[PDB]
Design a protein around this ligand. Structure first.
Ligand SMILES: NC(=O)c1ccc[n+]([C@@H]2O[C@H](COP(=O)([O-])OP(=O)(O)OC[C@H]3O[C@@H](n4cnc5c(N)ncnc54)[C@H](O)[C@@H]3O)[C@@H](O)[C@H]2O)c1
Ligand SMILES: NC(=O)c1ccc[n+]([C@@H]2O[C@H](COP(=O)([O-])OP(=O)(O)OC[C@H]3O[C@@H](n4cnc5c(N)ncnc54)[C@H](O)[C@@H]3O)[C@@H](O)[C@H]2O)c1
Ligand SMILES: NC(=O)c1ccc[n+]([C@@H]2O[C@H](COP(=O)([O-])OP(=O)(O)OC[C@H]3O[C@@H](n4cnc5c(N)ncnc54)[C@H](O)[C@@H]3O)[C@@H](O)[C@H]2O)c1
Ligand SMILES: NC(=O)c1ccc[n+]([C@@H]2O[C@H](COP(=O)([O-])OP(=O)(O)OC[C@H]3O[C@@H](n4cnc5c(N)ncnc54)[C@H](O)[C@@H]3O)[C@@H](O)[C@H]2O)c1
Lengths: 344, 344, 344, 344
C-alpha cells in the first residue's frame, strides 16, 4: 500500500481533553422518561445539542432574573406567523405570568392575536391552491387557514376603538405610537386567551415599528377616510425600547424567527453594549448576507451581544421547538416566579 | 420476473402534448454567446427555468409600462443587506433612469446607501470572528465589512439635517413620515452614486415603515435628547403607498428578499384586488409558515396577486441573479425608456 | 374609502366545514403534561402539525404490523451523520427489539456504529477550524469530533476480518455483497451498543450500495494490496432489497435524511407499486430539483408511494425530531412488540 | 444622551488595510458588457463574490493543468438531477473536449444521459400533482417531466447489451464494475449528445458506487431473472478512483451538489493528503451535520483538501450557476485546450 496514502488516512491523534463530552443519545430501554429524553438532546449532536444549550441559556436568564426593574430584562421577539400558529398559546402563557419583560412582534403578530378572540384559525395544507381559496374568501398562511370573514369581524370590532383613539388624540392630547396602540387593543379585547390582554395587564410593552403592515393597517387606512388625522409615531417607541435596554441591570434575548423583530431587539441591546444572554430559534441561513439568517457571532461584531456572552441559535421551526424549550425552562420555574410575586 | 413488479416499472405512457418544451441546455460548442446562453436558462430546468420566466415576466411589465401615471406602476422592493452589497449600483441605475415607480426597503436599505457616499463597505468573510472584529470596531454584514467609523461620519453628516427637520416640523408645520424623510436625505446627500438622490430627483417615493430599526434610528434617538419632538408618522405613508396601487392603471412587483418589504408591497396591491405581475427573487422557504418564505400562490389566495397573473419566484441569492435579470430586461430597453422621455 | 379597495379587503367568506380543526397550542397553565404537550403539536401548525401527522402515520404502520413476514414490512433509512450523532442509540433500540424489518444506510452509517464500540465521538463546534483540527488529527463532523485514532483502531480491528473474508470467498466460495459484509461486521463487533450486532442477531438485512465510500472502503483499499481479490457485488443486494418489497404483505417507509438511502428504499417499493405508508424527516428542499429535497408527492408520480397513501414529511433536523417520534410511537408499543414475540 | 449608549454605538474604528477591496456592483450606465458584468460579481458580495472566487479557482486548475497524466487531474462530480436538467449539455461539452479527467455521478446521472438519446425530458412544474401524473405514466423530477415510456424504450435498448455483458463475464472472463459498465453503455449509445459516449471516447473514467439505485438497476434486476449471474464489483472501482488521486501531479475538484458524489471525490483526494483546488456549487447547509451540507473547511480537517488550498463554495442552484462558471473558465480556454492536443 502506498506509504503516502497510508500516512494521510492513518494519521495518529492524541486523546481529547478530559472535559470532553461524549456523543450519546437517549436509551429507550429505560422506557420513556421525558425529562431525561429532553436532557439527552444535549449530547445527541447537531441542533439537538443546540437545543440542549438553549435550555441551559434560557435557564440562566431566569435564574438571574429571579435574583419595575428585575435582575434581568428579558426581550421576547417573534414573527407574525408564529401568532397565526399555536405558539400564540405558548407566548400568552409567558406574558400572562409576567415571565418576560418586553415583547416585539410585527403587525401580524399583533392583529392575529386579537382576531383569534373573534374567530379561529384552521388547519389546512401548504398545497392548497390560491385561486380556489380566493374564490371562497379563504386566506392561506402556510398550512393554516384564516377565513376572510375573520377580518370583516375584526373591522366591526376595531372601528369604534379607532373612533375613540382619534378622538383622544385631538381632545385629550394623546400621542399615539405602536406600543400605546397595542396596549389599548389589549385592554379592549378583554379576553384571557389574548397575549396583549395580559401584556397590557402586566405592563409589558409591545413594540412593532411597522404596525401598518397588515389588517390593522388596512383598517386604519379605510378609517382615515371618514376620520383622518390618526398619527402613529415610531420615534417615541424607539426611545422606549432603547431605554429599556440602557437601564436594565442585565438582559436576555429570546427571539423566534428573524426580520425587524430580531434586529430591533438586538439594536436596543447595543445601547448597553450588548445583551448578556441570547437564544434564537430560526430557520434563516447566513449565505445570502441577510440579517435574519445571520449567526449570533455576527451580532457580537456589532456589539449587540456581549463578547463574554454565550449566544445559542437553534436552526429549527419554532412551532416544534419553542414549546419544548418552554417546558424545560419557564414551565419548570413557575413556583419560582410565583414566589417573587409573593404567591408561593 | 414478477409480473406485478414489471407492470409497475414498465408502465406505458402516451406522448406529451405538442406544446411541450424539451429540456436542453446551452451548447458551448457555439462559443460564448451570452444572450443565447442566458435565454438557454429557460430550458435548463429548476431555478434556471424560473429565471428564464422571471425575464419574460419583467419584460411584460416593461412593455406594458411603455404603452404621473404610466401604463404600469412597478413596485421595487429589496432588503437592507442588498444595499450593503453591490446591488446598490443595480438599484440606483433603475431609479436613476426612472424605470420603476415605487421603492420600499427597510431602515438599513436607506441609511447604507447614504453612508456609502461618505465611506465604502469592504469585502470580508462570513467566517470572521465577532470578538476580534468588535475589538477593532468593525461591523460584519455577511462576508462584507462596515468599519464603525462610517457610522461616526454618518452622525456628523446627519445631525445638522435632523436639527433642520425638527425645526421645520415646529415652525413650518412639516408632518414627517419615513418617505418624506428619505426624500430629504436623498436631496441632502446630493451624490449621483446614491439611490435616494435619484429617487428624490425622479419623484419616486420610498416607503420604509420601520425606519427606526438601524443607524438612522440610533441617530434620531441620540438627537432626541438635545432636540426632542421629532415625529415620524407611519399612517400617512400607509395612505401614500396604498393609493399608489389603487390608482394604478396596472401594477408589477419586483421583490428581492422578503420580510416587511415583500409584505408591504403585496398588501398595497391587495387594495386594487391584486398585482398584474410579480417576480420575486428570494431564498426563503415555505416550511416554517413564514411570510418571507411563502410561495406567490399563497399571495393569490389573499388577493395580493391577480388569479390570472403569472407570478414567478426564483429561489436564489439576488446578488448573483438581479444583475442578470436587469441585463436581460431593463438594460435591453434603455432606448425605449429614453424614448418616452423624448430622448431617443 | 374607495369601493374597490374595500370590496377586495373585506371580501366575505362562508364558514369552513364542520370537520375543520382549529389551530390551538398547548396550554402550560395545565403544567407540564408531556404526552399532551406532544399531541398538541398536531394543532400547532407548520412542522409541528407535520410531526403530529408523522406520529399518526408511524403508529398506523405499527398497528398494521402487529396484525419471516409480518403484516407490514418497515424500511428504516438514515444518513451516515445520523449514526455519528446520538440517534445511533435510537436506531439501535428499534433494531434491538426487532421493531423494523430492513435498514439502509450509507458507508458512514455502517462504519461509525462499529467504531463507536472501539472509541467515542465527542461534542465539538461547527466553527472549529479545519487547519488546526487537522494538525491535531481530529476529524470534524458538524459540531461533533472524531479523533483520527478511532480509524487507526478501526484498522487494527477490521484487517483480520478482511483476511478471513477474502479467505472464505476463495475457499468456501462466499459471494460477498454489502449486506452480507455488514451482517458479518455486526457479528464480529459482538457489542450490544451496536446497531449491526442487533440487526445481525434479529436477521434484519442492511443495504448500502456504496459501502466503499468511507473508512471501511479505505481499509478494503489498503488491504487489497497485501490481499487482492475481494469482491463486493451490489447486484445481488439489489435483488434482496427488491424482493423484500415485492413479497411484503404491506410496507411502511421511515426515512431520516435523503440521498441514496431515501431513493433506494422508494425504488424497492416501486416494485410493489408503492409503499403503503411513508414518513420522512429531512431538511432538504425541492427548489434545486434534487431527489433528497423532493416532496413525497413527487414519489407518488413515480409509483413509489401508493396514490391512496398519506405520506408525511417533517422539515427538520432528525436529531431533534426522531427521538420524539420514537417516544410517541415505537416506545409506546413496546409491550405490543413483546407480545408478538410471546413475551407479554 | 446616555454616555454609555453613545460610546457603544459611536465606537471609533481605524481604517481597513490598503489591500481592502471595496464593495461595488456593475454599473449598467456602461451598457451591457457581459464579461465585465460577470467579473463585477466578485465585488458584489455574498454568493456573487463566492462565484467571482469560484471562477478564479477554476481558472487556476486549468492554467495549472495546461502546464495520460496532465499537470492537474480534475475531478468533476455532479448529482443525478443535474443530468435530468440542461446541465447535461454543459457537462458533455467539458467531457467532449477532454477538459476534465475523472467523472463521478449517481445512477440517475448515468442512465438519464443515455435515455435522453432515446427520448427527451420535458419542462413541467414543481406543483404538478403526483396522482394525476401517475395515472398518465409521467414521472416528475422537480419542474421537469420524464414520460415513463422513456424507461420502456430504455429497456428495449439496454437488455441486449446486458445479454452480452453477462456473456462476456462468463466466457471472456470480464470482471464488471460500475466504471467499466458505464464506459460500455457510452460506446453502445454511440451518440455525440451523450456525456458517456465522449467519456468513453476520451478515456475519462466514470465512477458510480451505487449504480443499482435507479432504472439501470431496475433493468439489471428484471434481466437477472432470465439471465442470472451479473456481478458489479465496487471494490476494483475504489482502487481505480483512489490511484487516480494518489498518482496525480496535482488535483482540482469541481463538485455540483452533494451526497455520495461529493464525498467519494474528496475521499479519493484524502489519499494524496488533499486536493489542491476545490470549487463546489451546492445548496446544502451545515446545520444538520450532513456531509452534503458541510463547508469545505470541514473537509480540510479530514485532510481531503490541502490546508494551503483555497476552496470555494457557491451556495446556489448549479443549473443557474454552472453554465456561467463554464462560460468564464473552460469556454474561455478552448484554444488553450486545443493547443495541448496540437490543434491550434
Ligand atoms: N401571518 C403572517 O405571516 C403575516 C400576517 C400579516 C402580516 N404579515 C407581515 O409580514 C411581514 C413579515 O413577517 P415577519 O417579519 O413576522 O417575518 P417572516 O414571517 O417574513 O419571517 C422572517 C424570517 O423569520 C423566520 N421564521 C419564520 N417562522 C419561523 C418559524 N416558524 N421558526 C423559526 N424561524 C422562523 C424565517 O427564517 C424568515 O426568514 C411583517 O411586516 C408582517 O406583519 C405576516
Ligand atoms: N445590512 C443589513 O442586513 C441591515 C442593516 C441595518 C439594519 N437592518 C435591519 O434588519 C431588519 C431585517 O432586515 P430586512 O427586513 O431587510 O431583511 P433580512 O435581511 O432579515 O431578510 C429577510 C428575508 O429576505 C431574504 N433575503 C435576504 N437577502 C437575500 C438575497 N441576498 N437574495 C435573496 N433573498 C434574500 C431572506 O430569505 C430572509 O429570510 C430590518 O428592519 C433592517 O433595517 C439590516
Ligand atoms: N458522518 C458522515 O457525514 C459521513 C462519514 C463517512 C462517509 N460519509 C459519506 O457521505 C456520503 C453522503 O452522506 P449521506 O448519503 O449519508 O447523506 P448526507 O449526509 O450527504 O445528506 C443527504 C441529505 O440528507 C439530509 N439530512 C442530513 N442530516 C439530516 C438530519 N440530521 N436531519 C434531517 N435531514 C438530514 C440533508 O438534507 C442532506 O441534503 C455517503 O456516501 C456517506 O457514506 C459521511
Ligand atoms: N433525477 C434524479 O433526481 C434521480 C433519478 C434516478 C435516481 N436518483 C437517485 O437518487 C439518489 C440521490 O441523488 P443524488 O445523490 O444525485 O443527489 P440528490 O439529488 O439527492 O442531492 C443531494 C444534495 O445535492 C444538492 N443539489 C442537488 N441539486 C443541486 C443543484 N441543482 N444545485 C446545487 N446543489 C444541488 C442538494 O443540496 C442535495 O441535498 C441517487 O442514488 C440517485 O441515483 C435520482
Amino acid at each position: 500500500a502506498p506509504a503516502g496514502a497510508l500516512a494521510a488516512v492513518l494519521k495518529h491523534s492524541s486523546t481529547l481533553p478530559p472535559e470532553s463530552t461524549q456523543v450519546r443519545g437517549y436509551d429507550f430501554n429505560r422506557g420513556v422518561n421525558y425529562r431525561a429524553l429532553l436532557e439527552a438532546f444535549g449530547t445527541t449532536g447537531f441542533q439537538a445539542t443546540n437545543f440542549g444549550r438553549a435550555v441551559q441559556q434560557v435557564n440562566a436568564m431566569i435564574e438571574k432574573k429571579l435574583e419595575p426593574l428585575t435582575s434581568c430584562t428579558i426581550f421576547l421577539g417573534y414573527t407574525s406567523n408564529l401568532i397565526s400558529s399555536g405558539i400564540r398559546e405558548t407566548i400568552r402563557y409567558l406574558v400572562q405570568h409576567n415571565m418576560v419583560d418586553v415583547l416585539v412582534t410585527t403587525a401580524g403578530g399583533v392583529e392575529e392575536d386579537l382576531i383569534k378572540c373573534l374567530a379561529p384559525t384552521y388547519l389546512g395544507e401548504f398545497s392548497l391552491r390560491g385561486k380556489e381559496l380566493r374564490e371562497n374568501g379563504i386566506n392561506r398562511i402556510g398550512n393554516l387557514l384564516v377565513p376572510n370573514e375573520n377580518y370583516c369581524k375584526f373591522e366591526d370590532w376595531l372601528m369604534p376603538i379607532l373612533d375613540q383613539m382619534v378622538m383622544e388624540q385631538n381632545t385629550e392630547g394623546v400621542k399615539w405610537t405602536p406600543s400605546k396602540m397595542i396596549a389599548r387593543l389589549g385592554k379592549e379585547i378583554n379576553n384571557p386567551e389574548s397575549v396583549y390582554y395580559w401584556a397590557q395587564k402586566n405592563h409589558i410593552p409591545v413594540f412593532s415599528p411597522a404596525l401598518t403592515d397588515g389588517s390593522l393597517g388596512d383598517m386604519i387606512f379605510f378609517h382615515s377616510y371618514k376620520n383622518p388625522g390618526l398619527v402613529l409615531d415610531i420615534v417615541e417607541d424607539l426611545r422606549l425600547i432603547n431605554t429599556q435596554a440602557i437601564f436594565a441591570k442585565c438582559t436576555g434575548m429570546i427571539i423566534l424567527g428573524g426580520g425587524v423583530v430580531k434586529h430591533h431587539i438586538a439594536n436596543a441591546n447595543l445601547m448597553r453594549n450588548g445583551a448578556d444572554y441570547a437564544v434564537y430559534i430560526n430557520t434563516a441561513q447566513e449565505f445570502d448576507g441577510s440579517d435574519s439568517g445571520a449567526r449570533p457571532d455576527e451580532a457580537v461584531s456589532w456589539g449587540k451581544i456581549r463578547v463574554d456572552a454565550q449566544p445559542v441559535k437553534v436552526y429549527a421551526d419554532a412551532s416544534l421547538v419553542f414549546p419544548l424549550l418552554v417546558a424545560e425552562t419557564f414551565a419548570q420555574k413557575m413556583d419560582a416566579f410565583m414566589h417573587e410575586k409573593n404567591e408561593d
